PDB file of C-alpha atoms and ligand atoms in Angstrom:
ATOM      1  CA  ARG T  92     104.939  78.422  94.665  1.00 19.21           C
ATOM      2  CA  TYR T  93     101.522  80.019  95.084  1.00 18.06           C
ATOM      3  CA  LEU T  94     100.050  82.106  97.886  1.00 17.85           C
ATOM      4  CA  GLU T  95      96.362  81.721  98.737  1.00 13.50           C
ATOM      5  CA  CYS T  96      94.697  85.034  99.620  1.00 13.18           C
ATOM      6  CA  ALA T  97      91.243  86.145 100.643  1.00 14.17           C
ATOM      7  CA  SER T  98      89.279  87.652  97.746  1.00 14.02           C
ATOM      8  CA  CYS T  99      86.293  90.005  97.712  1.00 13.64           C
ATOM      9  CA  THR T 100      85.129  93.231  96.126  1.00 16.15           C
ATOM     10  CA  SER T 101      82.734  95.972  97.165  1.00 16.00           C
ATOM     11  CA  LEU T 102      81.142  95.875  93.686  1.00 17.78           C
ATOM     12  CA  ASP T 103      79.596  92.744  95.130  1.00 13.49           C
ATOM     13  CA  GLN T 104      78.492  92.035  98.678  1.00 11.27           C
ATOM     14  CA  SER T 105      81.421  89.594  98.946  1.00 10.99           C
ATOM     15  CA  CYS T 106      83.386  91.759 101.361  1.00  5.88           C
ATOM     16  CA  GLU T 107      80.389  92.798 103.431  1.00  4.17           C
ATOM     17  CA  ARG T 108      78.869  89.295 103.777  1.00  4.42           C
ATOM     18  CA  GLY T 109      79.332  85.662 102.820  1.00  4.97           C
ATOM     19  CA  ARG T 110      81.727  82.796 103.081  1.00  2.00           C
ATOM     20  CA  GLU T 111      85.302  83.986 102.573  1.00  2.00           C
ATOM     21  CA  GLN T 112      86.584  83.364  99.051  1.00  2.00           C
ATOM     22  CA  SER T 113      90.096  82.330  97.997  1.00  2.00           C
ATOM     23  CA  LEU T 114      92.364  83.365  95.143  1.00  2.00           C
ATOM     24  CA  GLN T 115      95.795  82.182  94.063  1.00  2.00           C
ATOM     25  CA  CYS T 116      98.504  84.855  93.690  1.00  2.00           C
ATOM     26  CA  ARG T 117     101.939  84.563  92.085  1.00  2.00           C
ATOM     27  CA  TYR T 118     104.346  84.874  95.069  1.00  2.00           C
ATOM     28  CA  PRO T 119     107.003  86.278  95.362  1.00  2.00           C
ATOM     29  CA  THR T 120     105.835  88.645  92.596  1.00  2.00           C
ATOM     30  CA  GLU T 121     102.439  89.134  94.329  1.00  2.00           C
ATOM     31  CA  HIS T 122     101.091  89.156  97.870  1.00  2.00           C
ATOM     32  CA  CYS T 123      97.766  89.242  99.668  1.00  2.76           C
ATOM     33  CA  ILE T 124      96.288  92.726  99.683  1.00  2.00           C
ATOM     34  CA  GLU T 125      93.469  94.542 101.463  1.00  2.00           C
ATOM     35  CA  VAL T 126      92.517  98.107 100.481  1.00  2.00           C
ATOM     36  CA  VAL T 127      89.855 100.178 102.258  1.00  2.00           C
ATOM     37  CA  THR T 128      88.466 103.630 101.553  1.00  2.13           C
ATOM     38  CA  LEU T 129      85.461 105.001 103.444  1.00  2.00           C
ATOM     39  CA  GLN T 130      84.083 108.527 103.126  1.00  3.33           C
ATOM     40  CA  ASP T 138      82.568 106.340  98.896  1.00  3.69           C
ATOM     41  CA  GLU T 139      82.827 102.950 100.663  1.00  4.56           C
ATOM     42  CA  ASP T 140      85.340 101.043  98.499  1.00  5.02           C
ATOM     43  CA  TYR T 141      86.678  97.714  99.762  1.00  2.00           C
ATOM     44  CA  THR T 142      88.833  95.082  98.061  1.00  2.00           C
ATOM     45  CA  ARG T 143      90.804  91.950  98.949  1.00  2.00           C
ATOM     46  CA  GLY T 144      93.011  89.975  96.594  1.00  2.00           C
ATOM     47  CA  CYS T 145      96.448  89.863  94.978  1.00  2.00           C
ATOM     48  CA  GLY T 146      98.844  92.735  94.482  1.00  2.00           C
ATOM     49  CA  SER T 147     102.294  94.104  95.180  1.00  2.00           C
ATOM     50  CA  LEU T 148     102.919  97.068  97.435  1.00  2.00           C
ATOM     51  CA  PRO T 149     106.478  98.239  98.120  1.00  2.00           C
ATOM     52  CA  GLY T 150     107.001  97.731 101.829  1.00  2.00           C
ATOM     53  CA  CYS T 151     105.446  94.297 102.237  1.00  2.00           C
ATOM     54  CA  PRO T 152     104.518  92.897 104.739  1.00  2.00           C
ATOM     55  CA  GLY T 153     103.085  96.067 106.215  1.00  2.00           C
ATOM     56  CA  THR T 154     100.230  98.514 106.509  1.00  2.00           C
ATOM     57  CA  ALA T 155      99.619 102.143 105.623  1.00  2.00           C
ATOM     58  CA  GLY T 156      96.744 104.324 106.701  1.00  2.00           C
ATOM     59  CA  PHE T 157      95.267 107.769 106.949  1.00  2.00           C
ATOM     60  CA  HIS T 158      92.168 109.122 108.600  1.00  2.00           C
ATOM     61  CA  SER T 159      90.535 112.508 108.998  1.00  2.00           C
ATOM     62  CA  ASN T 160      87.101 113.355 110.382  1.00  2.00           C
ATOM     63  CA  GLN T 161      85.372 112.227 107.198  1.00  2.00           C
ATOM     64  CA  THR T 162      87.744 109.936 105.251  1.00  2.00           C
ATOM     65  CA  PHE T 163      89.551 106.705 106.128  1.00  2.00           C
ATOM     66  CA  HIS T 164      92.145 104.956 103.935  1.00  2.00           C
ATOM     67  CA  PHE T 165      93.908 101.757 104.910  1.00  2.00           C
ATOM     68  CA  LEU T 166      96.171  99.338 103.072  1.00  2.00           C
ATOM     69  CA  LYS T 167      97.699  96.056 104.135  1.00  2.00           C
ATOM     70  CA  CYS T 168     100.024  93.610 102.387  1.00  2.00           C
ATOM     71  CA  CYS T 169     101.249  90.262 103.697  1.00  2.78           C
ATOM     72  CA  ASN T 170     102.638  86.867 102.748  1.00  2.00           C
ATOM     73  CA  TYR T 171     100.769  84.085 104.517  1.00  2.00           C
ATOM     74  CA  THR T 172      97.592  82.152 103.757  1.00  2.00           C
ATOM     75  CA  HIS T 173      94.474  84.351 103.916  1.00  2.00           C
ATOM     76  CA  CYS T 174      96.502  86.893 105.912  1.00  2.00           C
ATOM     77  CA  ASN T 175      94.256  89.531 104.332  1.00  2.00           C
ATOM     78  CA  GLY T 176      91.048  87.802 105.426  1.00  2.00           C
ATOM     79  CA  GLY T 177      88.992  87.982 108.577  1.00  2.00           C
ATOM     80  CA  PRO T 178      86.334  90.485 109.583  1.00  2.00           C
ATOM     81  CA  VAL T 179      85.814  93.622 107.520  1.00  2.00           C
ATOM     82  CA  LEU T 180      87.631  96.732 108.757  1.00  2.00           C
ATOM     83  CA  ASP T 181      86.416 100.238 109.379  1.00  2.00           C
ATOM     84  CA  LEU T 182      87.936 103.074 111.393  1.00  2.00           C
ATOM     85  CA  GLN T 183      86.347 101.708 114.581  1.00  2.00           C
ATOM     86  CA  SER T 184      88.224  98.418 114.206  1.00  2.00           C
ATOM     87  CA  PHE T 185      91.310 100.324 115.424  1.00  2.00           C
ATOM     88  CA  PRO T 186      91.559 101.269 119.106  1.00  2.00           C
ATOM     89  CA  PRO T 187      92.604 104.864 119.770  1.00  2.00           C
ATOM     90  CA  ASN T 188      96.371 105.089 120.066  1.00  2.00           C
ATOM     91  CA  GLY T 189      96.634 108.088 122.422  1.00  2.00           C
ATOM     92  CA  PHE T 190      97.526 110.858 119.962  1.00  2.00           C
ATOM     93  CA  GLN T 191      95.390 113.630 118.503  1.00  2.00           C
ATOM     94  CA  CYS T 192      95.787 115.544 115.237  1.00  2.00           C
ATOM     95  CA  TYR T 193      94.052 118.391 113.466  1.00  2.00           C
ATOM     96  CA  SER T 194      91.701 117.407 110.643  1.00  2.00           C
ATOM     97  CA  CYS T 195      90.408 119.083 107.495  1.00  2.00           C
ATOM     98  CA  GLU T 196      89.430 117.986 103.992  1.00  2.00           C
ATOM     99  CA  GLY T 197      90.493 118.984 100.493  1.00  2.00           C
ATOM    100  CA  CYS T 203      90.715 124.481 105.597  1.00  2.00           C
ATOM    101  CA  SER T 204      92.504 126.804 108.026  1.00  2.00           C
ATOM    102  CA  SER T 205      93.090 127.578 111.703  1.00  2.00           C
ATOM    103  CA  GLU T 206      89.594 129.166 111.843  1.00  2.00           C
ATOM    104  CA  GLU T 207      88.023 125.680 111.874  1.00  2.00           C
ATOM    105  CA  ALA T 208      90.512 122.808 112.147  1.00  2.00           C
ATOM    106  CA  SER T 209      89.191 120.314 114.693  1.00  2.00           C
ATOM    107  CA  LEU T 210      91.233 117.765 116.586  1.00  2.00           C
ATOM    108  CA  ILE T 211      90.415 114.109 116.064  1.00  2.00           C
ATOM    109  CA  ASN T 212      91.614 111.170 118.124  1.00  2.00           C
ATOM    110  CA  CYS T 213      94.048 108.987 116.179  1.00  2.00           C
ATOM    111  CA  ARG T 214      93.488 105.264 115.815  1.00  2.00           C
ATOM    112  CA  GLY T 215      95.537 102.173 115.197  1.00  2.00           C
ATOM    113  CA  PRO T 216      98.961 102.670 113.621  1.00  2.00           C
ATOM    114  CA  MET T 217      97.997 106.203 112.444  1.00  2.00           C
ATOM    115  CA  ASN T 218     100.148 108.007 115.038  1.00  2.00           C
ATOM    116  CA  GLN T 219     101.714 110.804 112.945  1.00  2.00           C
ATOM    117  CA  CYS T 220     100.049 114.153 112.400  1.00  2.00           C
ATOM    118  CA  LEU T 221      99.924 114.902 108.661  1.00  2.00           C
ATOM    119  CA  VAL T 222      99.597 117.995 106.502  1.00  2.00           C
ATOM    120  CA  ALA T 223      99.698 117.588 102.719  1.00  2.00           C
ATOM    121  CA  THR T 224      98.984 120.027  99.905  1.00  2.00           C
ATOM    122  CA  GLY T 225      98.331 119.485  96.203  1.00  2.00           C
ATOM    123  CA  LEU T 226      99.116 122.030  93.467  1.00  2.00           C
ATOM    124  CA  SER T 233      95.261 123.772  95.700  1.00  2.00           C
ATOM    125  CA  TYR T 234      93.765 121.189  98.071  1.00  2.00           C
ATOM    126  CA  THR T 235      94.984 120.714 101.635  1.00  2.00           C
ATOM    127  CA  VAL T 236      94.349 117.835 104.026  1.00  2.00           C
ATOM    128  CA  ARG T 237      95.287 117.184 107.642  1.00  2.00           C
ATOM    129  CA  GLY T 238      94.749 114.102 109.756  1.00  2.00           C
ATOM    130  CA  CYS T 239      96.309 111.073 111.404  1.00  2.00           C
ATOM    131  CA  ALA T 240      98.635 108.922 109.313  1.00  2.00           C
ATOM    132  CA  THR T 241     101.112 106.122 109.584  1.00  2.00           C
ATOM    133  CA  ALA T 242     104.702 106.930 108.666  1.00  2.00           C
ATOM    134  CA  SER T 243     104.443 104.582 105.682  1.00  2.00           C
ATOM    135  CA  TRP T 244     101.508 106.651 104.437  1.00  2.00           C
ATOM    136  CA  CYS T 245     103.449 109.896 104.957  1.00  2.00           C
ATOM    137  CA  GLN T 246     106.443 108.631 102.995  1.00  2.00           C
ATOM    138  CA  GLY T 247     104.903 106.468 100.271  1.00  2.00           C
ATOM    139  CA  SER T 248     103.184 107.475  97.085  1.00  2.00           C
ATOM    140  CA  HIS T 249      99.820 107.061  98.839  1.00  2.00           C
ATOM    141  CA  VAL T 250      99.073 110.758  99.414  1.00  2.00           C
ATOM    142  CA  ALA T 251      99.607 111.554  95.735  1.00  2.00           C
ATOM    143  CA  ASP T 252      96.959 108.935  95.046  1.00  2.00           C
ATOM    144  CA  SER T 253      93.655 109.691  96.809  1.00  2.00           C
ATOM    145  CA  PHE T 254      94.213 113.291  95.648  1.00  2.00           C
ATOM    146  CA  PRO T 255      92.034 114.532  92.767  1.00  2.00           C
ATOM    147  CA  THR T 256      93.905 113.985  89.467  1.00  2.00           C
ATOM    148  CA  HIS T 257      97.631 114.569  88.894  1.00  2.00           C
ATOM    149  CA  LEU T 258      98.701 117.458  91.093  1.00  2.00           C
ATOM    150  CA  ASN T 259     102.035 118.316  92.681  1.00  2.00           C
ATOM    151  CA  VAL T 260     102.066 116.877  96.204  1.00  2.00           C
ATOM    152  CA  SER T 261     104.133 117.877  99.216  1.00  2.00           C
ATOM    153  CA  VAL T 262     103.741 116.188 102.574  1.00  2.00           C
ATOM    154  CA  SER T 263     104.828 117.118 106.071  1.00  2.00           C
ATOM    155  CA  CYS T 264     104.440 114.745 109.007  1.00  2.00           C
ATOM    156  CA  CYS T 265     105.304 115.184 112.667  1.00  2.00           C
ATOM    157  CA  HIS T 266     105.043 113.079 115.829  1.00  2.00           C
ATOM    158  CA  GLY T 267     103.339 114.729 118.770  1.00  2.00           C
ATOM    159  CA  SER T 268      99.705 115.454 119.580  1.00  2.00           C
ATOM    160  CA  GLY T 269      98.342 118.399 117.634  1.00  2.00           C
ATOM    161  CA  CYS T 270     101.657 119.226 115.999  1.00  2.00           C
ATOM    162  CA  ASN T 271     100.057 119.722 112.540  1.00  2.00           C
ATOM    163  CA  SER T 272      98.058 122.751 113.659  1.00  2.00           C
ATOM    164  CA  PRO T 273      97.364 125.438 111.030  1.00  2.00           C
ATOM    165  CA  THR T 274      99.932 128.149 111.668  1.00  2.00           C
TER     166      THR T 274
HETATM  167  C1  NAG E   1      82.989 115.190 112.371  1.00  2.00           C
HETATM  168  O1  NAG E   1      82.505 115.651 111.108  1.00  2.00           O
HETATM  169  C2  NAG E   1      81.125 116.047 111.121  1.00  2.00           C
HETATM  170  C3  NAG E   1      80.773 116.460 109.710  1.00  2.00           C
HETATM  171  O2  NAG E   1      80.194 115.388 108.975  1.00  2.00           O
HETATM  172  C4  NAG E   1      80.905 117.171 112.135  1.00  2.00           C
HETATM  173  O3  NAG E   1      79.505 117.423 112.226  1.00  2.00           O
HETATM  174  C5  NAG E   1      81.456 116.798 113.506  1.00  2.00           C
HETATM  175  O4  NAG E   1      81.394 117.922 114.377  1.00  2.00           O
HETATM  176  C6  NAG E   1      82.899 116.315 113.393  1.00  2.00           C
HETATM  177  N1  NAG E   1      83.402 115.890 114.691  1.00  2.00           N
HETATM  178  C7  NAG E   1      84.699 115.679 114.948  1.00  2.00           C
HETATM  179  C8  NAG E   1      85.028 115.248 116.346  1.00  2.00           C
HETATM  180  O5  NAG E   1      85.567 115.830 114.093  1.00  2.00           O
END
């Protein structure tokens, strides 16, 4: 039948404050979705379809945080608003830079499910940080890159394994 999802948008203050709003989605074609990007601060909750649902995907560096979640139960995408600090450190560290070389790259402490060290380059921006595997292997890195460049990703598991060589 229908799936009832939380609904809000950062155009409004609906994410950042208020009673939680509902929206009907067409399941199984659609699911509850929650998309976060903070550098700027874009936040949305509603209906959508991500391949790999239910699940989450995420990436953070020193100055950017992306997170996505998809799920299939009532208001599963609701609750308190997320930021990077909602996620307890997971024990790993990765090098970080924005779109960068060995002459600067600082380690950050990885949080939540973002336990892979990432390097990605777009044909020329380069980014490094902490990522989930689903972020490494999806189309998510191609998105969140300026315009329509050629994207290659490399991820590894192990603290600091994405160091600039
Ligand atoms: C985080 O980034 C800021 C730049 O806005 C920088 O001043 C700071 O040293 C960085 N710290 C870490 C731990 O990455």
